[PDB]
Symmetry: D3
Subunit: 251 residues, 6 copies
C-alpha cells in the first residue's frame, strides 16, 4: 500500500500518471510550486515527493538521488503506483566546445557507463528515450528561448574517474576510462551526467515513457567559471522547461 | 579519386550531401525514379548507385547489401565523397502482435546484435538515429497514409539464429539467442532487421546523420501469410515515405 | 578547498581520518549522538555530514545515499579532506534461511553486481574489506551481544531485479539475474545490499581502509518487502556496533 | 521450396553437394565457366547462382556478398538444399611484409573480428576450416605453381576501422582496433578479409565442411587502397586454384 | 643460461628444436625410450625432462603437468632454449557416441575454455595447430594402425565442472557450464582435455609450431587397464612417428 | 572410494578434514615431517600425498602443481574424501618496494587473472579466503616473528606475460597485460602467484574453507639478488607458519 522507500500510497498521487524526477531533493518543491496546488507528500532518504496540478491533471514530483541505483527504486515504486511517464530534469557537464553553460541538452540516447541499466537489459539494448517525451522536451526547450542541443549523453556511475577527472585523491583513472573523455568528444557526445542510462534503459525495456533534459552547469572544455546568477537562472529555466514538457505529454 | 568499392567520384554525385540507402540493389532505380533526372552511376558487387534531383538538390541512392559489413563500406565511401545524411529504407519482421504487414516502423534505437557497430564504438554507445531524420521519417510516413510505429529495433547479423528461427538446416539456436525473441517482445522491441545497429552506431559516432524506416513484410506472431500484392504495395509505400523524408531533410 | 557535493572543508573535520558512512541521511545524527560533542556540518542532496569525538579523536559521520554512484562521491570527497578509513553501516536482506532479522553481517568480500566498482578496478579485482576493519567489526558485533555472521555479500545496483525480486511493476527479471538468488544461496553468499561492492573495490584499490557491517532487516526465504516493525531496533543495534568498531580502529 | 533469398530449388542444383562461394557476384560466372556445362540459375540481391559440372558431378557456385551476415544466409539456404561442402575464394590484404600481391593464402583459423560467428558459437569456439578442405586448397594452390601461405587470417566485419585503415572520412579508429594491425602482425597473422570467421565458425559448429583461399590484392605494410592493375590476374589465379580444390573434394 | 623452472641449459638439449610434451611426468621416459640414446636431464615439480635422438637429431621430451598454466611455463622455457616445434601427446574424454576408447584424436582447433590462452591472445584468436604438425600427426596415426579422428576439442581449465561432471562434492556446475557438454556435442566437438587451448594459442601467436594428439581413455556417452595401457602405448608410438615426419 | 587422480581412499586419510596444499610436490614431505607420525600415501603426476598427526588429529599434505587447473582437481578429490579446510603455502613475487624477500604475505583477496575460477563462479564473485583461515594465518605468521603483510594478491595463469615479464622468447606481452604490473602496484596489490584465485573462488563458492600464505622469493622492484641462504630460510619459515595456522584451525 505504502511503497517501501518512497513512503506514499497510490491515493496520495491523486491519479497522476506522469512524474517529474530531478536528482536533487531540494529541487522537488521548486518544481511543484511552478504548478497549481502543490502538496508535500513525503520525504525519506534521497526521496522527496510532492504532487501538484498541471492544466487540471495531477503530476508527481519525486527526486531520484544521484545515480542509477536510487533512480531505479524511485521509478519502480512510482510505476507500481500507476506512473507511466517519467521526465528527468538534471544538471550536466558539457564536453563539446560550444555547448555553453545555461544551454539545455535533450538526450537522444545514452552511453551506458552505469551498472543498473544491465539489471534491465543486456548492454546491446539502446538507452533511448521515448520519442514522444524527447519531442516534447525539445519543443519545450526551444519554445522557452533556450539554446537547445539534441544528442548523445555519456551516463556515468561515477562523478570522478568515469568522467575522466584527475583532480582527485589518487589522481589516477582506471584503464577503462583513460582517454575516454576525448573518445566521447570525438564521437560527438554532448555531455556527462549520472542517471540517464539507467532511467532510459529501464523504462524503454519496461513499457514506461522516459526522457532526460538537463541544464549545462559546467563545460569541461571551458575555463570561464559561471557565476551563481547564471546557475540559478539555468536551474530556473530547466525546471520551467520540464514542466512545459510535462504539459505537452498530458492528454 | 574514385572510391574503391562504389566506383564513383565526388564529381559524379553533383553535390549530393544526402543518400537514400536501401538494402536491395534492385530498389535503387525504383527510388531514383520517384525523383527528377535519375541517372545510373555504377554497379559493383552489391552496390548499385544512382543520382537524382529532389526539389533541385542532388541526392544519391546507393544499396548497402545485407548486413552491417557491406553497409559500413557504402556509408564510409559516400562520406568520403561528401555525403553527410543517410536514410535507410528497409524490410523487416515485426515481433509485436498488432504491428501488421504493410505498416512502417521508424527505429528510435537498435539492439546491437551485430558486429560492425563495435568497429565504431564500444557496446555501451547507443545505436540511435539522428533526431531530425527520425522526425522527418515519422512525418513522411504519417503524411503518406501509412500506419507508423516508433520504437526499438533488434538489429541482427543473421537472418536465422539471431532472429531465433528454428526452421533451419540444424534446427538449433546457440545459447545466446535461445529465448531471445520473447525477451525482446517483453521489452517492447518492435521488429528485426539487419543493418540499423551498424548504420546508426557508425553515423552517430562519426558526425553523420542517419535513420532507418522499414516496411513490415512478415509478422512473426501471425499465422496469416501476406499476399504478393501486399508485399509489392509495402515496398512501394516505403520508398514513397523515404523520398518524402529526404525532402523534409533538404528543407 | 571546499568539496563539490559535501559542502565541507578539511578544517571542518577537525583532523578526522575515520568516517562512519551509513546509506540513510537520517542515520547520521543518530550515529553522531552515540559519540561525544556531535556537531552538524552540512546537508546537501543525500549527504548529511556531522562530526563528533570518540575517545578524544575526531570522527566524521557522512551518509552515502543508496548505491555505488552516490557512495563513490562521498568517499572521494572525504578522502580529499584527509579521511582514510571508512566504516559502512547498512541494512541488508539475508538469503540464507537461518540468518535472522536483527542479526549483523560483516562482509568478507562482495559479489560485484554494481557498475561503479568498474570505474576503479577491472572486474577481476576483489571487492575485499581491509582486514583490520573486518576484524574490528566482528569483535565489536560480538562484544555488543549481537549475533554476527562473516561472509560474502552480493552487492547490487538495484533493489529489485538485481536482487531477483518479482513483486514488481513488470514482474520480470532480465536473463542475467534469472535464478541468481538461488545461485548465490548455493554458493554460500549471506546477503544482498547495495553499496559494498563499490565501496570495497574503490577503497582496496585506492589506499583507503574500508569495511561493511549491516543489520538484517528481512530474510528473503520469507518475503521481499521488509517489515517496518523491526527496523528501528535493528538499526539501533547496528549503529552501536559500528561505533564500537570505530573505537577499535582508533586504537 | 525455393529458398527465401537465393531463389533456387534443390532441383536447380542437379545433385550438387559442394558449393564454391566467392564474395563478388561477378566472379560466379567466371568460376562456372572454368567447369563443364555452366548454367545460370538466378540472381537476387548479392546472390548470383550458377551450376556447373566437374568430373561429371554437379557443383553450385553462389556469391555471398561482403560480410558474415550475407554469407550466413547463403550457407544456410544452400545447406537446406543439400550442400555440405563450402569453398570460399576471396581477395585479401596481406599484413606480413613478404606476402606479396598475387600470392594465395589458405586460412588455417580465423581471428573472429565479426559478429555473425557469435550467432552460431560463443567466442571460445575456434573459427577453423575442415581439415580435408584446407588440405585440398593447399594442394591445389601448390600444384598450380602459385606462391601459397598457410596460416591465421584476421576476419573483420569492416573494411576500414577493423582493418585499422586511417585514410577515411573521420581518420579515427575506435580504441579496440588501435594498434591492432601490428598486434596481428606480431602474432604471425597473415592477412585480413571479411567472411572467413563467420563461414568457418558456422560450418564447423553445424556439420558442414568449409575452407577459405584468397588472393592477395594489397600488402598493408605499403598502403591502404588496393591497386586496380593487379586485381584481374590475381582473381584469375585464385579461381583456377579453388576449382582444383573442389575437384579434390569430390572424390 | 638455466631457465627458472625446468632446470636445464641450452647445451643440455644438444641442439634440439623439437619437443614432445606429455602432461604426465611418468610418460616422459616412456616416450624417450622409443628413441635413441635417451638420457634423463632433470626433474623439478611437474617437469621431467629427457633428451633422445631421432634419425640422428636431438629431441627433447618434457612433461607439462595438468593445465595451461604449467604448460605455458614449459613451452616458454623450452623456447628460450631454442625449441620451436611442440608435439603434445595427451589423454582425453570423447563426447561423441562412436569415438571409442583407444582411438586417437588430432585437434584441428580448440574451444578455449581455459585462462592462459588469454595471456597470449584475445579470445577472438583461433586456438589452432600448425598445419604441418596436424598433417604429420594424422599421417603418423593412420600409419600406426590407429583409428584417428580430426576435429575440434574442448579444452578446459577444470576436469570437473568445465567438463560438466556432476559426480562431485557439490554436485553443482556453475551457470556458464550448465548444458555445455550437450552444446559441444551438438556442435560436433570430439573430446575434452586440459592443455590444447593454451598450447595452441600460445604457439600460434608466438612463432612456434604446435599440435595435440590424444588417446581416448573414456567416452562420456558409453574400460580395462589392458585397454588403458594399450591406449597410452599407441599414443606415444604415434607422437614419435609424427616427430619423425616433422624433422626431415 | 578411490578418486581418479590422487590415488588415495578416504580410509587412507584417517579422518582428516584439513589439508595443507603446497604447489611443489617436493615440499609435501618437508611439511609432513614438521608434524607427528608422517606417512607417505601416494605420488601420481604432480600430486604427492602424505598424512600426519597434529595435536592428535590427522592432517593431509597434498601438492597441487602449478596453476588453477591442477589445484582444482586436488581440492575436489580431497573434498570428496572429506576434507573441508585447505591451507595453501606458496612462493610469490612481491611487487611493492618494501615487501622484502623472506617476508610472508597472507592473501585477503585475489585478482582473478586465471581461468579456473570462472568454472566455479562468474567474475563478479570475490576470490576471498575464509575469514577464520586468514585470521589463523595472520596469527601464525606474526607469532613466528616474521614480517607479515595482509593484502590483495594478483593470481595469474602464467608466470611470464600475466606477470608482465618481458625477458622472454618473444619479448612481447599481449595488450590485456601491457602496463598491468604498474596498474596493480598503484592499486596496492602486494604480489603475484599462480593458484590463489582458483583456490579461493572454488572454496568460497563450494562450502570449503581456504586461505593462502606465501613466502616472498623475489621482489620485482629490487635489483639485489637474494642469497640461496635467504631463500632456504624463507621456505622453512613458510612451512612452520602454515603448520601453526593448521593447529589454529583444529577446534
Ligand atoms: O559535470 C557534471 C555535472 C553534473 N552532473 C550531474 O550532477 C549530479 C552530481 O553532481 C549527478 O546526478 C549528475 O547527473 C554530472 O554528472 N557531471
Ligand atoms: O523478418 C525479417 C524480414 C526482413 N529483414 C531484412 O531483410 C534482409 C534480409 O532478408 C535484411 O537486409 C534485413 O534488414 C529481416 O532481417 N527480417
Ligand atoms: O533486502 C534488502 C535490504 C536492504 N538493502 C539496503 O537498503 C538500501 C535500500 O533499501 C540500500 O542502501 C541497501 O544497501 C538492500 O539492498 N536489500
Ligand atoms: O585488404 C583487403 C582486401 C580484400 N578484402 C576482401 O574483399 C572484400 C572487400 O574488398 C571483402 O569481401 C573481403 O573479404 C578485405 O577485407 N581486405
Ligand atoms: O575425460 C578426460 C580424460 C582425460 N583428460 C586429460 O587428462 C588430464 C587430467 O586427467 C588432463 O591433462 C587432460 O588433458 C581430460 O581432461 N578429460
Ligand atoms: O614471481 C613469482 C614467484 C613465485 N610464483 C609461484 O611459484 C610457482 C611458479 O614459479 C607458482 O605456483 C606461483 O604461485 C609466482 O607466480 N611468481
Ligand atoms: Cl519511442
Ligand atoms: Cl540527434
Ligand atoms: Cl587488508
Ligand atoms: Cl576437421
Ligand atoms: Cl599453419
Ligand atoms: Cl568468511
Ligand atoms: Mg586510448
Ligand atoms: Mg532464458
Ligand atoms: Mg539458471
Ligand atoms: Mg567439422
Ligand atoms: Mg542451456
Ligand atoms: Mg595503460
Ligand atoms: Mg565460506
Ligand atoms: Na543516491
Ligand atoms: Na552483403
Ligand atoms: Na600443473
Amino acid at each position: 500500500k505504502t511503497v517501501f522507500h518512497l513512503g506514499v500510497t497510490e491515493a496520495d498521487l491523486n491519479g497522476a500518471t506522469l512524474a517529474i524526477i530531478p536528482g536533487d531533493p531540494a529541487r522537488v518543491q521548486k518544481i511543484a510550486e511552478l504548478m497549481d496546488n502543490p502538496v508535500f507528500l513525503a520525504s525519506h532518504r534521497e526521496y522527496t515527493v510532492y504532487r501538484a496540478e498541471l492544466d487540471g491533471q495531477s503530476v508527481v514530483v519525486c527526486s531520484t538521488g544521484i545515480g542509477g541505483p536510487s533512480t531505479s527504486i524511485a521509478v519502480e515504486e512510482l510505476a507500481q503506483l500507476g506512473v507511466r511517464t517519467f521526465l528527468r530534469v538534471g544538471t550536466t557537464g558539457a564536453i563539446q566546445p560550444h555547448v555553453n553553460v545555461g544551454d539545455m541538452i535533450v538526450t537522444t540516447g545514452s552511453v551506458r557507463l552505469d551498472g543498473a541499466s544491465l539489471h534491465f537489459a543486456p548492454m546491446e539494448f539502446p538507452a533511448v528515450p521515448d520519442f514522444d517525451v524527447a519531442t516534447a522536451m525539445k519543443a519545450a526547450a526551444q519554445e522557452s528561448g533556450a539554446t537547445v542541443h539534441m544528442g548523445v549523453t555519456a551516463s556515468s556511475d561515477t562523478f570522478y574517474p568515469g568522467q575522466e577527472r584527475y583532480d582527485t585523491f589518487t589522481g589516477r583513472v582506471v584503464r577503462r576510462f583513460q582517454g575516454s573523455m576525448k573518445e566521447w568528444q570525438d564521437m560527438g557526445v554532448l555531455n556527462f551526467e549520472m542517471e540517464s542510462a539507467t532511467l532510459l534503459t529501464m523504462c524503454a525495456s519496461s513499457g514506461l515513457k522516459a526522457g532526460c533534459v538537463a541544464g549545462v552547469i559546467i563545460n569541461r572544455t571551458q575555463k570561464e567559471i559561471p557565476d551563481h546568477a547564471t546557475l540559478k537562472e539555468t536551474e530556473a529555466r530547466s525546471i520551467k522547461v520540464v514542466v512545459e514538457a510535462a504539459r505537452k505529454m498530458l492528454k
